[PDB]
């Protein structure tokens, strides 16, 4: 599923990301835009053999288990397949654990490069929430 900008903003708000651990809603919408372009089925194979899965491109080396990644930690205790659903529940649950580390949203490279330091609120403006 490819979410519309406002559609995802509303969904993430329902999923409790409006002000989760100091991060405003716009951060999450912006992150999704640049990490997966709002595509829940997005996957990207990395050099180290790991793969980034879903709307928030969660990595198989540290966060989810896809059974094909060397040195897997599975910090989110969840199969990577669960992060490729049109239902964002699992991706949000895992993203919350990731951001609860001291590194915060810096875990998301696209967010760090295209969102951090910008007017992230702009990503939720002009939306019926």
């Amino acid at each position, epitope marked *: 599923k490819v979410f519309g900008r406002c559609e995802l903003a509303a969904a993430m*708000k329902r*999923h409790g990301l409006d002000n*989760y*651990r100091g991060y405003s809603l716009g951060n999450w919408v912006c992150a999704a835009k640049f990490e997966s372009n709002f595509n829940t089925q997005a996957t990207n194979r990395n050099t180290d053999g790991s793969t980034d899965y879903g709307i928030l491109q969660i990595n198989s080396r540290w966060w989810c288990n896809d059974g094909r990644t060397p040195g897997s930690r*599975n*910090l989110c*205790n969840i199969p990577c397949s669960a992060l490729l659903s049109s239902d964002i529940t699992a991706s949000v649950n895992c993203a*919350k654990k990731i951001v609860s580390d*001291g590194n915060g949203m810096n875990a998301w490279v696209a967010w760090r490069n295209r969102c951090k330091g910008t007017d992230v609120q702009a990503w939720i403006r002009g939306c019926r929430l």
Partner: antibody
Amino acid sequence: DVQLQESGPSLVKPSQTLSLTCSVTGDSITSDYWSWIRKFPGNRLEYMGYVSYSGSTYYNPSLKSRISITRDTSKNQYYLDLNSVTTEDTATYYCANWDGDYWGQGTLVTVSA
Amino acid sequence: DIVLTQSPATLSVTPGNSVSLSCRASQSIGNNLHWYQQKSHESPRLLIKYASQSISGIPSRFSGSGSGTDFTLSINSVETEDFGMYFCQQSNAWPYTFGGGTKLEIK
């Protein structure tokens, strides 16, 4: 499967440092975030803090920075140090993973002269 | 900090009947409210996560509802094994905080 268990002295004196150990069996401590929670005499629960995968820690401001949570991969266990305890620190201490799925049995520590 | 207020403090019920426990947050916490059950001489047990999400291994009679500042834990047809303490906990802001608890006992 995973198992957690607290260990350490059950009786300590005021002003000393209270130290507890949580032994993890079933998986490496490097694969999760680890926490400490305590229950006071009147069914009052307090989340003390947790240490995440990067080594970063989050401590409850209520502890006034008297707390330290550390890990030891080689022994697959993590710890809780609480400095200058008082009778207000008497409580049942529990270790559990961040998700809340795995908890230790809990251990009562009494602070008394 | 976020203050969680639970009510009633105590609730007596006859096995077979249903009940609902309340947990109110001083400030909005989204859906970041979790429910725990605790029996004497026992460690807390997670029943519901993120307000309404089910937990594998927990009886289906437990369900959670709510968002923002108002949350409820419901038990459809209370069983003897359900008597004990129930606590809500929020994870939207640090420090994580717990409600004062609701004691469920046989009437």
